[PDB]
Amino acid sequence: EKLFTPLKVGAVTAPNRVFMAPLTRLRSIEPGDIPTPLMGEYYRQRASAGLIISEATQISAQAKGYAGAPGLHSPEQIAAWKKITAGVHAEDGRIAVQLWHTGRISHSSIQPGGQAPVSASALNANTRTSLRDENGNAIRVDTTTPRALELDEIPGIVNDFRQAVANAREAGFDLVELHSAHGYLLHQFLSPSSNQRTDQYGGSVENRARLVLEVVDAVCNEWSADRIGIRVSPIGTFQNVDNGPNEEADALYLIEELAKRGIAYLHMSETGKPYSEAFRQKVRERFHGVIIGAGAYTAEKAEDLIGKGLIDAVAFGRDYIANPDLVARLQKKAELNPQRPESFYGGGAEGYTDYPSL
Ligand SMILES: NC(=O)c1ccc[n+]([C@@H]2O[C@H](COP(=O)([O-])OP(=O)(O)OC[C@H]3O[C@@H](n4cnc5c(N)ncnc54)[C@H](O)[C@@H]3O)[C@@H](O)[C@H]2O)c1
Ligand SMILES: Cc1cc2nc3c(=O)[nH]c(=O)nc-3n(C[C@H](O)[C@H](O)[C@H](O)COP(=O)(O)O)c2cc1C
8 A cells, every 4th residue: 555655754755665774783994994886785685664863873983982983074085985875775765874872882992092982871771782703793782881971062963963964964874864863972961861060961851851852953064954853762771771651742842842843754763662643643743744653564664653643754673674676575475585683783794685585
């Protein structure tokens, strides 16, 4: 039914509503956190997606928390991405870059100067990140305790998102997705759990949401609201960052503010309690742009919610890892390739560009 109809998402139009979710795969070149042609072949393979959303990409070297995640702050990086976006565009695809700062989800050993990473407050994420061993294989490691950002460092962060956005537009991407979910830097600010500041960036929900909203305004000035999407995970717990004691009302707060900027899309990452339709209707009521749902979605769950007018499209993660031509398969109701989780992270072409199409 509707899953395969067109949808305008800000400055682009997607041929269908089957989006490829951002997927950290950790195959970049170090030093330099540089995308590769292999990565290019991987994204090109999936260009039939209504929209491709790249793996999280550092806005800065300070943003880095995972060995192998690409950056978008250097000329080496921008040139490499250019080629990747070009490839997608040759296949008539569309590609958004998801930008993050990992904040406390990082390790000193991969920070500039071997320093502690930064966050809203000085509290261990109490989870793991992915680093590389001597042989360059991916390994899980306990995260380093962060340094709380000084008040006067915050403008530097906002500027980093702005500049990374300018770089996105230089590199060819059609859109930018702000990574404000999964317990990374923006979310570390949004959450009472990880934010214990007593300055204007802490306390009330308005204070906790200040950083993310200044990023949104900086990047709407820098480019356009029609080019900006944002990913939130506002209900539940993600990598040990919960959403505090009134998560639903605090979500509707941020969503109402987001609406005011008229940005292109709200990408809700789900997944542990499901979203009530009640809540879903409240979101749809407050936000006027494109709504993208993700998190253990099925083609059928997606077809429902869409028809019900509660979301406009769906991003598939794991299914996109394993099915380049996921779009065709969903429409032919074809079987999907088995997933190979042991190669989600790190490595080379095996479990990356070697999943076959129909
Ligand atoms: N850039 C990002 O925003 C980012 C990056 C990575 C993951 N994520 C999200 O964060 C969530 C947490 O993912 P996670 O896996 O890091 O948390 P996690 O490691 O706590 O959960 C992994 C679960 O999967 C299984 N599993 C994981 N590794 C395994 C292994 N080596 N062998 C056998 N079974 C294994 C285990 O049963 C385990 O309970 C993910 O589901 C994903 O949606 C986001
Ligand atoms: C291996 C892997 C890497 C991921 N990387 C990111 C990421 O970089 N940014 C992000 O917002 N979500 C990331 N996610 C979460 C996915 O975007 C997506 O929401 C999730 O996989 C959806 O569930 P599904 O796989 O059942 O479709 C990742 C998930 C997986 C499994």
